[PDB]
């Protein structure tokens, strides 16, 4: 278990919007099986409730819909998969 700071709640939400976007793109390829499609829909719905909660706790100008967070998540994923900051520079902002 790794010690993390206060920004992790936000970062994790964004990362997992990236994860959800990956599942969604994978499902279009007809390669995500039926229990996996089920985890996709469960992830989406728990994500949407955490984004409603987290957006209430944040200033109005720092609130972001699922779609905006998905792009942030995708940028972070690109940086992790290549381990290269160049693949997604905006992933380094909250």
């Amino acid at each position: 278990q790794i010690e993390v700071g206060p920004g992790a709640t936000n970062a994790t939400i964004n990362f997992e919007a990236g994860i959800l976007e990956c599942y969604e793109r994978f499902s279009w390829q007809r390669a995500l099986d039926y229990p996996g499609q089920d985890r996709l829909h469960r992830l989406k719905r728990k994500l949407e409730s955490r984004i409603k909660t987290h957006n209430k706790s944040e200033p109005e100008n720092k609130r972001m819909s699922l779609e905006e967070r998905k792009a942030i998540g995708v940028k972070m994923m690109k940086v992790l998969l290549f381990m290269d900051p160049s693949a997604g520079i905006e992933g380094f902002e909250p």
Partner: protein, 153 residues
């Protein structure tokens, strides 16, 4: 003059900037301030994403007060088998990962050679290994041989 270090997710913190500071020495400051070991750090500039050269001054690489550096953490954690040879020419096999410390390795040897960890020190390729450092900082390869050296006291 301060340097701003930014991690994936948005967490940022400040590191005082010295002109002639080497990028390797930046990693040691981040290590000290965050506990991310230097050999696990990958540093790059913002917004280009160009990697820092470890043996060149930061001012020589376009960094000045207010500049941002991006930190990405790389973790080996790939177990490998090494040998540790005692002062009688006998070698025991140990499994380690490059992200383990020298202190963890001495704990293993301690239990197999029945010598207190304070009565010996380890060396790889003649260079003595320091407890707090991680094994990757000495470049251990599979089936290499670390040597056990006995202290008088």
């Amino acid at each position: 003059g301060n340097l701003t270090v930014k991690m994936l997710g948005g967490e940022e913190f400040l590191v005082p900037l010295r002109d002639s500071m080497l990028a390797s020495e930046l990693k040691q400051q981040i290590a000290l301030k965050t506990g991310v070991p230097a050999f696990q750090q990958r540093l790059a500039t913002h917004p280009a994403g160009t990697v820092l050269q470890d043996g060149i001054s930061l001012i020589r690489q376009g960094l000045c007060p207010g500049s941002t550096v991006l930190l990405v953490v790389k973790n080996s954690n790939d177990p490998l088998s090494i040998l540790v040879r005692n002062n009688k020419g006998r070698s025991i096999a140990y499994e380690v990962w490059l992200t383990q410390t020298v202190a963890e390795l001495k704990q293993q040897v301690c239990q197999q050679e029945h010598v207190q960890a304070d009565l010996f020190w380890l060396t790889f390729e003649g260079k003595p290994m320091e407890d707090k450092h991680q094994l990757g900082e000495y470049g251990l390869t599979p089936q290499c041989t670390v040597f056990m050296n006995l202290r008088l006291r």
